[PDB]
Amino acid sequence: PNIADKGSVFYHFSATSFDSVDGTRHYRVWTAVPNTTAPASGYPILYMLDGNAVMDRLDDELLKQLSEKTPPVIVAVGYQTNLPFDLNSRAYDYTPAAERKSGGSNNFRQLLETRIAPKVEQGLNIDRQRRGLWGHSYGGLFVLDSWLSSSYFRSYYSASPSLGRGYDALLSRVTAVEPLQFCTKHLAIMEGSAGVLSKIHTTLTILKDKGVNAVFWDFPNLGHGPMFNASFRQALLDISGE
């Protein structure tokens, strides 16, 4: 989150604090607002997990590029720490309850949607109809879990969801959704690395078949690591109208 301390000509920042209900997890949320005027409808907005990591890698070339179209307000939900990732915190907040401590997705969603989001969009013109959610790895699983129950977000970017570790059933739950309340919902799964492809292919096949607006972003041979950057930058690019 140095570009926040540093400062950009394309965006201006502000940091704020939050705590989990159990009081053992502490959050640091950075809100980045474009320095360019917001469209009539308002700035689109993207809430992003692993906030410290996103903020530490956010560069101006990207900010400039987003400014070429409709730059979004960026909400990097991180943790009060000096490292880019809080392995224990995220390991709990991002994993689905349905399927070390895990399964705190619902409570983290509660915190996110009824406390953080309401507070950070305050005094800002946001196209609330253009809200997006992005997550990678465990964060990826949280987006899927959110897609399944939230009506708060419109665009959902699940990147490299680590379902192959006690969460394989989440994909199953996702491809199982009732056609009714999901027909129009957006869902973009992002992968790279290199039958995971087949499962994703099939998933999107069944979802599109149900009438769901599911899409696949492929980044051939990109490791799990490089996928963090690729997906978080492309999602921003996408939400900005690329």
CATH of the domain at 54: 3.40.50.1820
Q: Which residues pair with 218 in a beta bridge?
A: 191
Cβ neighbours of 51 (radius 10 Å): 25
CA distances from 49 to 22, 35, 154, 172, 179 (A): 20, 23, 16, 23, 28
Domain holding 86, by residue range, is 1-242
What is the stated resolution of the deposited model, in angstroms? 2.3
Name the pairing type of β-strands 43-48 and 73-79. Answer: parallel
* Resolved by: X-ray
Give the active site residues: 137, 224
CA distances from 54 to 4, 186, 200, 205 (A): 11, 23, 25, 31
Domain count, the chain: 1
Give the Cα separation of 95 and 93 in Å (integer): 6
